[PDB]
Structure 1
Amino acid sequence: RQWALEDFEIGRPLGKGKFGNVYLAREKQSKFILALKVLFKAQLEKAGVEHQLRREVEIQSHLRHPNILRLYGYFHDATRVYLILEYAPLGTVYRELQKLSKFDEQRTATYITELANALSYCHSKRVIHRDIKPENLLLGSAGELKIADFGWSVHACGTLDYLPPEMIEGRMHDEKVDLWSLGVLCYEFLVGKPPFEANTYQETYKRISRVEFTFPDFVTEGARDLISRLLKHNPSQRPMLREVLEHPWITANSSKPSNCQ
């Protein structure tokens, strides 16, 4: 399809990022509600990321999963690039965390199950995720989690909070990156901040490289066990997604079945 900007009525700004603004929008003919992400070419080219976006968009076009945000299409004019995206009405996990301070074990294990399901589906088709931040997790009409960043690779910053040691130490990274991501998110969901949070990039780099973190008292033995298994310095020592999905703390607390499958 040949989409142009006049094909859509543009509504309220949903959010802003470094490169793009996201707007609620509705396709004029069908009245289909969606989100339009608007990115400036000149800015993308200046940062050296236009190709990276192109590759991520191509990867994203292949992913069809209830817990992955859908890319409907794209287009451009002289100035900018427009991504036609699924509208996730309940907004970001980042914002939900800010409002609730921390999540209970049931919400947390349901979210981790949903992420593990989405990542399992991605791994099955040779697709790996880079780091996963709560700002880049959206919530659908029924509160289902949607991975919304296009941060994929067949094989292809920044705050360091969500990056694994092998990505910051200049090492080799594989499908085990997104296992680390699960460990960071599991901890952040339960505690209200990520495990290596610090005042400086420099303090954070060191905490990540050393895997230097501690649990507050309220974190239960089951959650500690899962988080400690995922946050291993050596990628090869991290579990398979199957193991995450079968973990007794996950199975006892999740509201959602662990569709591996």
Structure 2
Amino acid sequence: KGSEQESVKEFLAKAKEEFLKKWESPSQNTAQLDHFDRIKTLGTRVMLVKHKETGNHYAMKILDKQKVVKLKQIEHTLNEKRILQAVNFPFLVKLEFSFKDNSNLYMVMEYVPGGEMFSHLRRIGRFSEPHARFYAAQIVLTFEYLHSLDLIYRDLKPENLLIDQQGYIQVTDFGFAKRVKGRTWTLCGTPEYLAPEIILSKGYNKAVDWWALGVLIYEMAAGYPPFFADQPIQIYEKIVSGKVRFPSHFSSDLKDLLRNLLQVDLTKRFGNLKNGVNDIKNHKWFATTDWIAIYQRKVEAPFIPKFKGPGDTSNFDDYEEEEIRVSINEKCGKEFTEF
């Protein structure tokens, strides 16, 4: 616990004062639908839109209130918007506006044009270890930030990590993020990325994010996840078994880090010991990482996405376009009153 650790501590203290102000007094109803021209679907929904008054492009997430109710996601959706409007960190996508109408909820975020990490990783096959380390370091700092605010993220995966014009990561989709000081119990996440304590229906805490980091680093460096199969149940059987196999090109340092992150024993999992995140940040695999330089975006990125111009979506897949219908009757008003 030296001078560098005290500075992190003080930085996180100021970050928490700012977060809590917005957490306790959330912003609400800061734009309306006809402020935007709708361009194209970016994921399924999230749409590219253009703000008329400024000409800025944004990514607008649209949720059908009736479908949220049927899927029992009311409280998770209130979590997502309340957390997103309160956070502020370089590697988190920024929420610029939110609002609702008779049918839908809307979250309008900064447009990140470089595409999902998922698309680049699948196309290239795998990332080199320096490449994967660059991205992993950003997730390490982002979880240090989120966890210090008593937030658990619970859906880390390449599909949710966007590459910006500087080649850095922006985390999107807070649909399962939750502020909780005790343990929690919800069965949620993506199968390949679930910690064993989730699968086995135990109480669990922020250590599930550090397990998921282990899955992410493995998938970036290997090109495939550490546990995969054609059916989710078969994936879960592999996750709880306690064994992991590594590609032969994995360095010795990388395997040792992943055995400590993909650790079924919670009393032994990195990120969850007395030293907290510093067991990770001081691991030999991260010896060349300058954490301050990463935070300041001063490190040279592995690649810069192709940019054809404003509003171009060539780094995203194409999706079938569907109408945005707004009923003449208010749906689910009481359930979403605080949104």
TM alignment of 1:8-157, pairs within 5 A: 8-16=36-44, 21-150=45-174, 151-155=176-180
Shift of 1:158: 6.4
Aligned to 2:277: 241
CA distance in 1: counterparts of 2:243 and 2:228, whole angstroms: 10
- What SS does the aligned partner of 2:205 have? coil
Instruction: Report the alpha carbon displacement of residue 254 of structure 1 after superposing the two structures with TM.
Output: 7.3
Normalised to the residue count of structure 2, the TM-score between the two structures is 0.71
Gap change, CA 1:177 and 1:158, over 3 Å in 2: closer
Letter in 2 for 1:225: D
Which residue does 2:7 correspond to in 1?
A: none
TM superposition score normalised by structure 1: 0.92
- Tell me, yes or no, if the aligned pair for 2:132 and 2:220 is still in contact at 8 Å: yes
Letter paired with 2:32: A
Q: RCO greater where, 1 or 2, for CA within 8 Å and sep 6 or more?
A: 2
CA RMSD, Structure 1 to Structure 2 (Å): 1.9
Post-superposition offset of 1:27: 1.2
> Structure 1 residues 257, 182: closer, same or farther in 2, change over 3 A?
farther
Q: 2:154, 2:189 within 8 Å by CA — same for their partners in 1?
A: no
Cα distance, 1:233 vs structure 2: 0.5
Aligned partners of 1:127, 1:176: CA distance in 2, in Å? 11
CA 1:49 to 1:173, structure 2 compared with 1: closer, same or farther past 3 Å?
Answer: same
Q: How many residue pairs align between the two structures? A: 256
C-alpha contact (below 8 Å) 2:155/2:189 kept by paired residues: no
**Alignment-mate amino acid for residue 222 of structure 2:** V
User: Following the alignment from structure 2 to structure 1, what is the Cα–Cα distance between the partners of residues 213 and 71?
Assistant: 29
Counterpart Cα distance in 2 of 1:33 and 1:251: 39
Larger Rg: 2
Counterpart CA distance in 2 for 1:172 and 1:134 is 26
* Structure 2, unaligned runs of 5 or more: 1-28, 271-275, 296-339
Higher strand share: 1
> Which residue identity is paired with 2:78?
R
Q: State the identity as a percent.
A: 29
For the 8 Å contact 2:155–2:190, the answer to whether it is kept is no
8 Å Cα contact 1:113-1:258 kept in structure 2: yes
SS of alignment partner, residue 53 of structure 1: helix
Structure 1 unpaired stretches of 5+: none
Give distance in 1, aligned partners of 2:89 and 2:267.
27
Q: Which amino acid in structure 2 is aligned with residue 251 of structure 1? A: A
